[PDB]
């Protein structure tokens, strides 16, 4: 077996030990293996996967394979692979093209190695994506392959936005499931995963004390909620920025001061608009938005000396790292940790005090500087992925006549009953005991004893 | 002026001082007063109101009046009135029939005094309700009045469930707005209000140390989330019960142990099914469900001696207080605080150690033993109420032709843009500064710079 | 029986019900009753007591009486009495002179009624004091009575400071025990009691939401630690001031921003030295120092409109309330809650926005606006009081010859073994289980299996 | 230069970059460098140092050298060295013998290389120790060297206990300073350091989600306080064991349930005495005691399958790892992470579910699996070390006449004024501003405006 490319195949046994531990931390996903292994619901599925090649993703891949699938895999970020996980998957005879510290050229080459087998398009019929890069390449470069693909299952709110833009423009070629919008994904992974992993990554990269220091979290959606908690629970003094007044209300009620980098919140592009007094007191800035240029050049210029700058949104463009590359000298401390010297670009002084510390070159910091979300949290997201793969594969969209395809071409979420079933396995993993409604109580609130327990409008 | 009934009109000046302070804590609601006072959008409205006669409700009532309405008011709970608030409203020449410590007969009489003026139905044309009791009485006993009513604005998730049952059965006679499902209601009031007011009520009633003691919170919806936090932040060791596995998942991730009162969660009605070991260690039980008999007779029998029992859901039927009335002796400590002696019903021993402490006779504890939610939280709920009253009044359902009425007979929520506008005023009240999107950023995420900022599916 | 003065003797039965509950919350104190009742170690003791006449103090008084003492009692603060507690004690035939809302003249008259019985000095032979006022009156006005007194047991760090000044000057006439410096007093009561009771008092007085608002806590000793936690756990954004860099270090590490009201910390008496920007953002100031004028006139002038001002240190002079009385108009909201109108002193405008809310007229806010510390915390302080009374009474200093008195005239703390025994009863009250050392383990760390477990230098 | 032994000298540049960052996080220690560099107070000092060879210790070493000292260094634990720190120190021409993953034989050899230079005793005249191993070797094996040594500065509460045993027995040969008992050491490092670094180490070793899982912390001294917080802030459900009722009282008040591994707390050595129900629910056990066999063989047998076991006390003997070595098979996952298979000793099944995960082979977990305490915390401990070295070096005990030596042979602490001065530099590092007392306020509380601010009895 040679149809793979990883950093170091001798890391496989270490990865396999970590996969075995992870399986014990992932009861929803393992439960699906056990439930469906007889049936082989993914027999004949040929899945192109593009998602962070971590130990958690290894358990996902091996679940899909245990259910009958074949796969070809790549990472969706240049710094997120755990090389022992990639090695263990390759050593199992699964095609994977992923290593920590890819260049952009290598990143694109890895996705292409999944798409092509022996120099020609693979017989793919399903896509599992995280962020939409693989989806975009297939639509732009490999439309013939999409003719034979039954569906896309997309992990991220960023990627879903990209799918919805395509649907609106009539350019989406295959149906999709929005995995993000399961409650056991968005209100588990996006929030509690970042709670676990943000402070982890900052400690691993810097070993800085966080207690007593000042942080600014840009955004207060699910990731910004989790991130703010990650830092506050360590004793940081956390301030929060938002454009959405409802999320800002939540931040206030949650005990944070809501501030803007700009005077009166007005971002008009001048240095004069920056709240220099505010930014000059910040020790750590974290972007969480999924938006562009939310930690901009003028903000970077105004930050307190020796501040840490990082991004936990999907794509690096949240921070103006291009400005920093053009203007300032980068001193690498160790992989994924750079001092950015604001003195200029013509070399640097190792003892200069006027620098910022950038983590993961602005790429997702939890995966870049640590190991991303823990297995017991990714259990929820990845159980949803498996259920979504099963649903779209069984629907067989590619084999439908044109008129029937037109009725099915949509971006949908999984039903609440399945979200509940995933949650129950997670709860049992903690040793939790859910109460069963009596028939009188189920009648009283208007639900089945089996669920679903909430209307689709419920926000949790 | 004599068209009122309150405990003590001499409390009015104290109430008025507290209304003036509350106005300073309610910027959304005060902002609506300022914005709409010229236009008089509620000129000609005649509103029957049934909601807890607190200081916060006084600010609501006076906003409605300032916008042009006439009202006739009662409380929706026998213990929730603040007598100084009722007095201040009556002293202002507004019909109010409410006092703390009503009997059930008096409660019904008060609602009837709003409905009848001078012994005949008042020419009401709007309803503001909290829990659905007024709505039910109008449908059952005064259906002719509904022929002239343009709509109902309902505060509570309980009352909305009741309205949806009526709609489904074809018995709802006028359209309604579900105020609860604004984010600035459900994810503000239900959660943060109970966070503020649950520990407040327990301290006022008992003066018990909470730190280091064991609590069981039944339910983990919005009220159970806020309640659990109210107790955990004081240092309680909190366990959480749930029937909904998604809510139970949240509780686990939030750092609580998820337990059932019943062995393996099976509530089969025998004493043998009670987890006596668990209940024998609990110092405080709080019900949050909106369901029936979630703290049942067998649970009450198994609780640790001297445990506190209370309910923060809308109706008292969450706890089997009828069982306690039939079997055990009640020693009143002070109003809304009773020791329930498990020794029997034939008198009590003042020094008996085998008792429970019941707060507010099992009625909503925050309002019964304290003052309910604080003004700055109720600002959100009550701004929504005013917007909802304006919308339904302006739509004039009662005046529509039959075919037009058929198209508008619905239970609806307010638009997200208005939810956002309420939130923004709340945030400004904390001194928060919301950032404005640049045109490029608004394009990038697919929103208007003015909002709304999220799709209707977003859960916050 | 007529040898008492209370607000309303008909409150006795309510007080007695609350005493019975409190006994169930005070296992250390009740354990001393049970242990020593046979022996009657306080038979012949005649105790002048001056400490907050709360339910908790009632349990203390009745323990002393159960052990053989007779007492005459007063409160040590004009606003701290719970009138039902005072009534219950009077109804039991115990001389008590205390009510909530005394004037200064009445306060002094009440202490004098304890000292004098039937117009002549009582046959006192012990003193229990909280803050040193009774101790001072005896030394200045009744030195003949001190000849027959065996000792003073003093609750407070303020009062201990006053005792140590007297000892140093050679004016202390009888020995004392510093009850404060038991760990089960200072590191229980001073910290966790204020954690429980500060937010309680502010809610009762104002009903303000605390979450999301800005607080300044002046001091970070035991009370400032507890107070800061009381507010932070509610979601306040808390800043801390200190003069002691070690306590300030603790505040930083605990996750607070450490600030001064004065520019660069320099308090030189001018308006120019005030950090107006800082004070203009503060919603709540709490003094915790035991020092003088730590919330001074210039600070008061600079506070944000509608800020709440309160003091939880023993004496009101922490806040310059005299300045406010001389310059600004006081609008009483309700007892212990005043709006202080910064517009001037010539009447007030009920709708003026430029006011501060002062709680308890600057007197200890927890006792003034709520009920002070909870029974389960006061159990520790008051068990120490009883042990201290027993020790000094048994030593019989007054009966010693002059040369022997000279050897015993000291201010001392209780031995660690007794502090440990109190703590063990508290722990058992929570259902806690302490592990017993094996003989090998006790040898390994150099302690007895029975304790004491730490050297006297240990700080906990 | 060849007088060193490290893992990899090519790591030096990386170490030096991390030292430069650490200097920016250590203002107290850097401030001492600046203050004393002119004076060279350690000119002629020849310091044998034995303390964890981390980046933080590198800043300490280079401060000592900057003040005039020569040193010879080793680590005090086999797993605590950061190889890049050791390399940087060796590359600077400083003798260091330390690497991560020493054997016990290598550990002893490294200490011997500090003691011997060119095969003969070095002319050492000062000792800096952490845990007492170097001190013991000098007293037992090299007593002639102690004739020329002016003093020992000891980091740890374990090592101080060892010094006090020697003093009591008349076997201590040179005076010592107890560095641990500075408040800026014990109530900074022991508490907040473990708060930072315990959860860090567990995440690095296992990548386990902690939220929602059950932990047992054995001990509630400074390390157990910080450790419990490290876990609770992540959402663990933490129970605490203690032998000291005062520490157990604190745990209850801090919101933890206090439990014993043994039924009724009685550790009589039989399996029957183990509370199997309790231990069978524990996911993580952490020992913090400084005692022996506090996680014993019978406890290990009863723990829930797949529990994590670790120790953060100074020595590994807290956990019965010898029992595990004799009876159970060890599967290495990666360095400092072993699965201990309870199935037996004859090989292991890679898929066995009945194992425990042991971190750092039971040695101090924060240093073994992460990087120990962060620089900004170690600044306090290490500033104290430098002050202590200066004091004892300047006192010149070895040169004193016999009668003079007898008066100075003691174990002492640094003065409070110096503790305060360290704290002040720490506070300024956070941007904190300490208030200066006015003359009137200093008089009122009986202190100098310059401090010290508290009596020596104050516990903070
Ligand atoms: N690193 C991880 O493991 C991880 C985990 C989950 C999600 N994500 C990624 O994080 C991003 C955010 O995801 P989410 O679920 O929080 O989305 P979300 O929509 O819940 O929240 C994003 C928030 O950013 C706010 N925002 C937008 N522009 C802003 C600006 N200029 N200033 C301040 N606030 C602004 C929005 O109002 C919104 O509330 C996405 O790219 C998502 O894919 C990363
Ligand atoms: N006292 C107050 O001020 C206040 C504030 C807001 C809402 N409320 C009332 O509180 C109630 C709950 O409101 P909410 O917004 O939390 O509703 P919700 O639907 O968000 O939550 C109720 C929860 O109870 C759970 N539940 C139902 N039966 C259960 C059982 N037998 N055991 C355990 N859990 C069970 C459900 O699964 C659900 O998650 C309603 O009656 C509402 O009107 C009171
Ligand atoms: N209300 C209550 O129930 C209650 C409970 C316990 C103690 N107390 C009282 O509270 C007071 C404080 O007691 P404590 O045990 O915290 O004493 P403490 O000595 O532990 O702490 C007082 C703190 O105030 C600081 N301080 C002094 N002057 C200051 C200034 N100008 N600015 C800022 N900080 C300053 C000191 O450095 C010290 O750390 C005493 O009067 C005590 O009797 C009240
Ligand atoms: N890993 C680190 O970085 C680090 C940091 C500081 C201290 N330490 C070490 O940690 C240890 C503890 O230090 P500390 O400052 O907390 O000491 P401490 O004396 O403050 O606390 C130890 C606690 O253990 C308790 N204890 C003793 N035997 C027990 C038993 N059988 N069961 C339960 N509790 C028991 C004691 O009562 C005491 O309260 C020492 O070995 C110290 O050197 C390690
Ligand atoms: N202070 C207060 N005034 C009026 N309504 C309140 C209140 N506190 C809680 N409520 C409302 O009471 C509802 C339940 O009947 C939930 C909440 O909207
Ligand atoms: Cl996402
Ligand atoms: Cl509701
Ligand atoms: Cl005190
Ligand atoms: Cl130590
Ligand atoms: K991970
Ligand atoms: K209220
Ligand atoms: K009390
Ligand atoms: K470190």
Numbering used by the authors:
A (entry chain C), B (entry chain A), C (entry chain C), D (entry chain A): 10 to 469
In the authors' words:
By hydrolyzing SAH to adenosine (Ado) and L-homocysteine (Hcy), the enzyme SAHase (SAH hydrolase) serves as an important regulator of SAM-dependent methylation through the control of the SAM:SAH ratio, and is an indicator of the biological methylation activity of the cell. SAHases are usually active as homotetramers. The protomer has a three-domain fold, with two prominent domains, the substrate- and cofactor-binding domains, separated by a deep crevice. A small C-terminal dimerization domain locks two subunits into a homodimer by quaternary complementation of the cofactor binding site, where a tightly but non-covalently bound nicotinamide adenine dinucleotide (NAD+) is found in its oxidized form.
Two complexes of Zn2+-containing PaSAHase were crystallized in the presence of K+ ions and adenosine (Ado/K+/Zn2+), or an inhibitor, 2′-deoxyadenosine (2′-dAdo/K+Zn2+). Additionally, the latter ligand as well as 3′-deoxyadenosine (non-metabolized adenosine analog) were used for crystallization of zinc-free enzyme in the presence of Rb+ (2′-dAdo/Rb+) or K+ (3′-dAdo/K+) cations. We present four crystal structures of PaSAHase/ligand/ion(s) complexes at resolutions of 1.35 to 1.75 Å. The complexes crystallize in two different forms, either as a tetramer or as a dimer from which the complete homotetramer is generated by crystallographic symmetry. In all presented PaSAHase complexes, the four subunits exist in the closed conformation and each of them binds an adenine nucleoside or adenine, as well as an alkali metal cation, K+ or Rb+, in the substrate binding area. The K+/Rb+ cations are bound in the monovalent cation coordinating loop (T380-S384) in close proximity of the purine ring of the ligand, but they do not interact with the ligand directly. The coordination sphere of the K+/Rb+ cations is a slightly distorted pentagonal bipyramid formed by two main-chain carbonyl oxygen atoms (T380 and H382) and the side-chain oxygen atoms of T380 and a highly conserved Q65 residue involved in ligand binding. Three water molecules complete the coordination sphere. Finally, the catalytic proficiency index kcat/Km is one to over two orders of magnitude higher in the presence of potassium than for other ions. These findings clearly demonstrate that the enzyme attains its maximum catalytic activity when the K+ cation is bound. The K+ ion stabilizes the enzyme-substrate complex in the closed conformation for a time interval required to complete the catalytic cycle.
